[PDB]
C-alpha cells in the first residue's frame, strides 16, 4: 500500500472493491448467463480433461478479460504511474490463477464418484469387470493432474518475481530521499530487512485469504445439488437443507470459536518483544565503553525476560486442547452424518466419498488461521516500525 | 552440544548411541520376548483404548525405564554436572513420548478394518446391521482420540520448557566470561537472539528425524503380516514380498531422488546472504558519515543483489516439478497395486482401506525433508556464526 507501487493507495482499494462486487452480482444472480443464450452454451460438462475448453468455460475467460481490461484502462488514464503494468495486471493474473486451481480441485472431486462405484460393483460380483476399465479411470485422472502440475509451477515463478518487483519499488523510493531520512537511528536495518519481510508476508496472507473464500463459494452449489439424497440427519431429524447448514456451521463456527478462545495471545507476544528489546539495548551499551556490566542489573533484566516469558507457555494450553479436539473429531464428523442415510440405502459407495472429500477439502483449505499467527505478530510490528520510520 | 549443557559433548553422544543399539539388539531380534515367557504375557491385543494396560505393553514400559535408569546412573557417577537432570532425563522422556504417539497411530490404523467391513455389509445386505453397532464403533474411536489429545498437550508444554532451559544454560556460560568476550563486534546481538534460534531449531529437527525412523520401523511388520492377501503385483507378476518391497522403494527412492536433484540450492542461498550482508555494511558507513552515500556504488551493490538473486528463482522450477509430480502420482500409486487382486475379488473393503492408510501415513509422516530445509540455510549459518564468535 505504498506510493511507489499501486498507483494511489487511496481511492484505489475502494475502486477495486466496488467493481469486483458489481461484476459478481451481475454475473451470478442477475442472469448474465443469457450470454449463454447468445451462443450455443450446451451446459453439459464432461469429466475428462477436455473440460477446460468447452464453451461454458471459454465464455467466462473472455468475460474476465473484458472486465479487467476496462478497470485497467480507467486507472491508466485517470492518473498514470511508473509500475502500473505490474501493480494492476500482475495482481489480476494472480487472482485468476488461484481461481483456476480451485476449479481443478472441483474437477477431481467430481471424478471420485464413478471410480468407487466401479470398485463396489467389482467387489460384489467378480463376473462383471475387466482391468481395462480400471486403466482407463487412472488415465483420465492423470490427464487432469498434468495440467495441474504445469499451472502450479508457472504460478510460483511469477508470484516470486512480482514480490521482488515490489521490493525494488519501495527501495527506489526510500533511497531517492536519503538525506532527510539519513539521520533516523537504525535506518540501515529498515531499508535492508523491513521491505523484503513486509512484501513477502503481505503476499502470503492475502493469497491465503482469497483462496479460502473462493473455495467456499466454489463448493456450496455442489452440496446443494447433492443434498437431495440425504433427507434426515441423525438426531435433529429432518431438515430441508441438512448438509449445507451442517457444513457451514461446522466450518465457520470451528474457526470462529477457535480464534476467540485464543484472543489474549498477541498481547503477550508484544510484551515479550518489548522486554527482549530492552535487554538487548542495555547489552549494547556495555559493549563499547566503560564497565556498564552491573551483574545486579543483568540479573534483574533476565528475571524480567523470564517471568514474562513463562506466562506465554501457560496461557497456551487453553489454545491447544481446543485445536486438537476439533481436529480429531473432524476425522469422523464427516461420516457421522450418514448413518441413517446409509441404513435407508439411498447413498451408495461413491456418493459417500464425494461428501467425505468435500468436507475434507473445505477443512484443508480452511487451515490458514492456525498458521496466521505470523500476521498477528510480526506484520504489525513491521508496519508500525516502518511507518514510524517516516516523518 | 555445548559444554554447559550435556555433560561432555564428546563421549556422551557416542556412548548413548552404542547403548541404544545394544538395547535394541537385545530386545527386538535377540529374543527379549522371553521375559514374556516368565510372566503370563498372553500376547493377544484388544482394539479399544484398553490396549495400553495389558501386560504386552506394560512389560515394555518397565524395560524402557530400566535401560534409561542404568545409562543415566553411570553418567551421574562418572562426570557430575549442574543441568544433568534436564540434560539426561528430559531427553529420555521426549524420546519415549514420541514413540507413544506413534503407537496411537498404529491403533487407529488397526481400527479401520472392522468399521469398513461393517459398512460393506450394511450396503450389500441391509437386514444384518442395526444402527447401535455404528454408534459403538464411533464410541471406541473417540475412546482412543481422547488419550491422543491429552498426551499431545502435555508433551508440548514440556518440550517448550526444556528448550528454555537450554537457553538459560548457554546464556549463563557466555555472560560469566563477558570481559574477555567484551570487545568482539556485536556481542549483544549474538547473546540476545542466536542462543534461542539455535536451541529451538535443533530441537525441532532432532524430533522430526526420530519421528520418521520410528514410523517406518513400527509399520513394516504390519505390511509383512498383511502381504499374504495380495499375491500378484500389477505387472511384474508374483514376488515373495511384493508389498513391502514396493513400499520401501517408492518412499525411500522418492525422497532420495527429490533431495539429489535440488542439491545446488544451499550454495546459492548462502551467496545471496553474503552479498546482502555486504550491502548492509556498506550502507552502515553512510549512516553517520557524509561522503559514503555514493549513488553509483549503491547502484552497483543493488545490481549485485539483483543479478545474483534471480538464479535462485530459476533453479527452483527444477525442484518444484519433481516435488509436485511425486506428490500427485502418490495419490493413486497406493491403489494402483491392488487392481488384479480387486478384480479377482480376494480383498474385502477393509483391507483396501487399511493398506491405503498404511501408505498414506508413511508418506504423510515422511514430509519432513521437504519442510526440514532449514538445516541448509540458517542453522548452519547460526552454528558457524556463534562458534566463530567464540575464540
Amino acid at each position, epitope marked *: 500500500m505504498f506510493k511507489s507501487f499501486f498507483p494511489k493507495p487511496g481511492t484505489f482499494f475502494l475502486s477495486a472493491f466496488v467493481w469486483a462486487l458489481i461484476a459478481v452480482i451481475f454475473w451470478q444472480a442477475g442472469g448474465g448467463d443469457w450470454v449463454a443464450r447468445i451462443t450455443g452454451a450446451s451446459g453439459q460438462i464432461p469429466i475428462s480433461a477436455a473440460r477446460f475448453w468447452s464453451l461454458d468455460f471459454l465464455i467466462f475467460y473472455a468475460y474476465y478479460i473484458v472486465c479487467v481490461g476496462l478497470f485497467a484502462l480507467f486507472w491508466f488514464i485517470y492518473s498514470p504511474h511508473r509500475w502500473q503494468y505490474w501493480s494492476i495486471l500482475g495482481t489480476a493474473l494472480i487472482i485468476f490463477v488461484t481461481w483456476f486451481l480451485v476449479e481443478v480441485g472441483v474437477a477431481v472431486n467430481a471424478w471420485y464418484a464413478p471410480f468407487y462405484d466401479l470398485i463396489q460393483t467389482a467387489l460384489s460380483s467378480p463376473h462383471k469387470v475387466t482391468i481395462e476399465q480400471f486403466y482407463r479411470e487412472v488415465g483420465v485422472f492423470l490427464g487432469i493432474a498434468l495440467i495441474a502440475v504445469v499451472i502450479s509451477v508457472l504460478n510460483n515463478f511469477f508470484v516470486s518475481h512480482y514480490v521482488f518487483r515490489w521490493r525494488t519499488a519501495m527501495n527506489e523510493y526510500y533511497m531517492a530521499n536519503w538525506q532527510q531520512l539519513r539521520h533516523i537511528e537504525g535506518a540501515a536495518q529498515r531499508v535492508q530487512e523491513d521491505t523484503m519481510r513486509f512484501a513477502s508476508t503481505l503476499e502470503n496472507m492475502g493469497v491465503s485469504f482469497i483462496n479460502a473464500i473462493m473455495t467456499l463459494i466454489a463448493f456450496l452449489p455442489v452440496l446443494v445439488t447433492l443434498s437431495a439424497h440425504v433427507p434426515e440427519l441423525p438426531i435433529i431429524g429432518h431438515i430441508p437443507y441438512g448438509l449445507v447448514i451442517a457444513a457451514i456451521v461446522w466450518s465457520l463456527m470451528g474457526t470462529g470459536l477457535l480464534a476467540v478462545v485464543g484472543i489474549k495471545l498477541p498481547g503477550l507476544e508484544f510484551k515479550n518483544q518489548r522486554v527482549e528489546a530492552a535487554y538487548r539495548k542495555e547489552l549494547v551499551y556495555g559493549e563499547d565503553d566503560a564497565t556498564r556490566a552491573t551483574p545486579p542489573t543483568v540479573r534483574e533484566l533476565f528475571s524480567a525476560v523470564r517471568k514474562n516469558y513463562f506466562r506465554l507457555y501457560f496461557h497456551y494450553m487453553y489454545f491447544n486442547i481446543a485445536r486438537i479436539l476439533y481436529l480429531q473429531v473432524d476425522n469422523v464428523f464427516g461420516l457421522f452424518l450418514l448413518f441413517p442415510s446409509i*441404513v*435407508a*440405502g*439411498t447413498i*451408495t459407495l461413491g456418493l459417500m466419498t464425494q461428501i467425505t472429500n468435500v468436507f475434507g477439502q473445505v477443512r484443508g483449505a480452511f487451515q490458514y488461521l492456525i498458521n496466521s499467527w505470523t500476521t498477528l505478530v510480526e506484520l504489525m510490528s513491521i508496519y508500525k516500525r516502518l511507518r514510524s520510520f517516516e516523518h | 552440544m555445548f559444554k554447559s549443557f550435556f555433560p561432555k559433548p564428546g563421549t556422551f553422544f557416542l556412548s548413548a548411541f552404542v547403548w541404544a543399539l545394544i538395547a535394541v539388539i537385545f530386545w527386538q531380534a535377540g529374543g527379549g520376548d522371553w521375559v514374556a515367557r516368565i510372566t503370563g504375557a498372553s500376547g493377544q491385543i484388544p482394539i479399544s483404548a484398553a490396549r495400553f494396560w495389558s501386560l504386552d505393553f506394560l512389560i515394555f514400559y518397565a524395560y524402557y525405564i530400566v535401560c534409561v535408569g542404568l545409562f543415566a546412573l553411570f553418567w551421574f557417577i562418572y562426570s557430575p554436572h549442574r543441568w544433568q537432570y534436564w540434560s539426561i532425563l528430559g531427553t529420555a522422556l521426549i524420546i519415549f513420548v514420541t514413540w507413544f504417539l506413534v503407537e496411537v497411530g498404529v491403533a487407529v490404523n488397526a481400527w479401520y478394518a472392522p468399521f469398513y467391513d461393517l459398512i460393506q455389509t450394511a450396503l450389500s*445386505s*441391509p*437386514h444384518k446391521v442395526t444402527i447401535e453397532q455404528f454408534y459403538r464403533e464411533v464410541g471406541v474411536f473417540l475412546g482412543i482420540a481422547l488419550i491422543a489429545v491429552v498426551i499431545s498437550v502435555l508433551n508440548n508444554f514440556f518440550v517448550s520448557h526444556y528448550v528454555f532451559r537450554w537457553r538459560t544454560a548457554m546464556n549463563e556460560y557466555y555472560m560469566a566470561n563477558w570481559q574477555q568476550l567484551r570487545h568482539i563486534e556485536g556481542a549483544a546481538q549474538r547473546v540476545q537472539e542466536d542462543t534461542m534460534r539455535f536451541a529451538s531449531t535443533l530441537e525441532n529437527m532432532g524430533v522430526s528425524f526420530i519421528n520418521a525412523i520410528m514410523t517406518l520401523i513400527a509399520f513394516l511388520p504390519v505390511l509383512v503380516t498383511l502381504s499374504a492377501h495380495v499375491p500378484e503385483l500389477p505387472i511384474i507378476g508374483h514376488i515373495p514380498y511384493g508389498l513391502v518391497i514396493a513400499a520401501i522403494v517408492w518412499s525411500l527412492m522418492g525422497t532420495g531422488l527429490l533431495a539429489v536433484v535440488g542439491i545446488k540450492l544451499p550454495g546459492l542461498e548462502f551467496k545471496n546472504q553474503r552479498v546482502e550482508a555486504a550491502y548492509r555494511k556498506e550502507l552502515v558507513y553512510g549512516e553517520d558519515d557524509a561522503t559514503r552515500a555514493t549513488p553509483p556504488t549503491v547502484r552497483e551493490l543493488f545490481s549485485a543483489v539483483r543479478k545474483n538473486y534471480f538464479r535462485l528463482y530459476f533453479h527452483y522450477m527444477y525442484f518444484n516439478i519433481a516435488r509436485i509430480l511425486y506428490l500427485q502420482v502418490d495419490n493413486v500409486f497406493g491403489l494402483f497395486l491392488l487392481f488384479p487382486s480387486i478384480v479377482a475379488g480376494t480383498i474385502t473393503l477393509g483391507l483396501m482401506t487399511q493398506i491405503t492408510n498404511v501408505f498414506g501415513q508413511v508418506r504423510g509422516a515422511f514430509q519432513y525433508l521437504i519442510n526440514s530445509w532449514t538445516t541448509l540455510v540458517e542453522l548452519m549459518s547460526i552454528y558457524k556464526r556463534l562458534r566463530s564468535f567464540e575464540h
Partner: antibody, heavy 120, light 107 residues
Framework: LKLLDSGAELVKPGASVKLSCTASGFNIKDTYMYWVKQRPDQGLEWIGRIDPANGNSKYDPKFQGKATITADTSSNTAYLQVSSLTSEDTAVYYC??????????????WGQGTSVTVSS | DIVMTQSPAILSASPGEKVTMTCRASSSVSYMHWYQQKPGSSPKPWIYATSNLASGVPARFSGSGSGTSYSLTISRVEAEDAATYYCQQWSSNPRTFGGGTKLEIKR
C-alpha cells in the same frame, strides 16, 4: 396388512407369463419383496428378491436367466416374469415381505399364491 | 449352499405330551426361523432368529440353540396342531429351506 396375488392362470408350453402382488397397508420402500415356489412335492424353493428403495436384485444361481423380478414403487407392486415354460413348471408362487427398516410386529407375511398349469 | 438336514421326518404325539424337532445346518448360520403350514394355506412364522417369538401366538411354542444345531419344543400339543413345520436359514444369498416333519395327533 394385505397382499393380493393374481388369479389362477393356464398357459401354453413355451410361452411366458407375468404375475403381480399388490401391497396395501404399508410402504414398500421399507421392505424386501421376495418370491417362493412350491412344487407338488411339498418342498419349498427360493427364487429371488429385490429391494425397492434403490432397485437391486439377487437371484438363485440355478434360476438365473429364467425368471426376472421387477418392482414399481409408484403403485405398490412387484412382478415376476417366467419364460420358456416346460412340463416342470406346475407349481404355486407366493410373494412375501421382510421388514428391514422400522422393525416391529410380524417380520414376515406371505401372500396367497397363484396356481400355474402348463399343458396342451 | 448350506444344506439343512431336518429330522425326524415323521412324528407323533398325544394331547398333554411334549415333542421336539431338530434342524441341523451344515456350517455356521446364526440366522434361522421356524414356520408352520396347515393344509391348503400359506406358511406363518413362529420364532424369529430362533429366540424371539413373533406376534401373538400361544406361548407353548419356543426353541433355542446356537452354532449349527437348533431345536423346537411344543409344550402341550393339542387338537389344533396338525401341520407341517419347515425351517429357513438366511445367512447367505441363496437361501435354503428345510424338509418338513408332518406332525400327527393320536386318539
Amino acid at each position: 396388512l394385505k397382499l393380493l396375488d393374481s388369479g389362477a392362470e393356464l398357459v401354453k408350453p413355451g410361452a411366458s407369463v407375468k404375475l403381480s402382488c399388490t401391497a396395501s397397508g404399508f410402504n414398500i420402500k421399507d421392505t424386501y419383496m421376495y418370491w417362493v415356489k412350491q412344487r407338488p412335492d411339498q418342498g419349498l424353493e427360493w427364487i429371488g428378491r429385490i429391494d425397492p428403495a434403490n432397485g437391486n436384485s439377487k437371484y438363485d444361481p440355478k434360476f438365473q436367466g429364467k425368471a426376472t423380478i421387477t418392482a414399481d414403487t409408484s403403485s405398490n407392486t412387484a412382478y415376476l416374469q417366467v419364460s420358456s415354460l416346460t412340463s416342470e413348471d406346475t407349481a404355486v408362487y407366493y410373494c412375501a415381505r421382510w421388514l428391514v427398516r422400522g422393525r416391529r410386529g410380524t417380520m414376515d407375511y406371505w401372500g396367497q399364491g397363484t396356481s400355474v398349469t402348463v399343458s396342451s | 449352499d448350506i444344506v439343512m438336514t431336518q429330522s425326524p421326518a415323521i412324528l407323533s404325539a398325544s394331547p398333554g405330551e411334549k415333542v421336539t424337532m431338530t434342524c441341523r445346518a451344515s456350517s455356521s448360520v446364526s440366522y434361522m426361523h421356524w414356520y408352520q403350514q396347515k393344509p391348503g394355506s400359506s406358511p406363518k412364522p413362529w420364532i424369529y432368529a430362533t429366540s424371539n417369538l413373533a406376534s401373538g401366538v400361544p406361548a407353548r411354542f419356543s426353541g433355542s440353540g446356537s452354532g449349527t444345531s437348533y431345536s423346537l419344543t411344543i409344550s402341550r400339543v393339542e387338537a389344533e396342531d396338525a401341520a407341517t413345520y419347515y425351517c429357513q436359514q438366511w445367512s447367505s444369498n441363496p437361501r435354503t429351506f428345510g424338509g418338513g416333519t408332518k406332525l400327527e395327533i393320536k386318539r
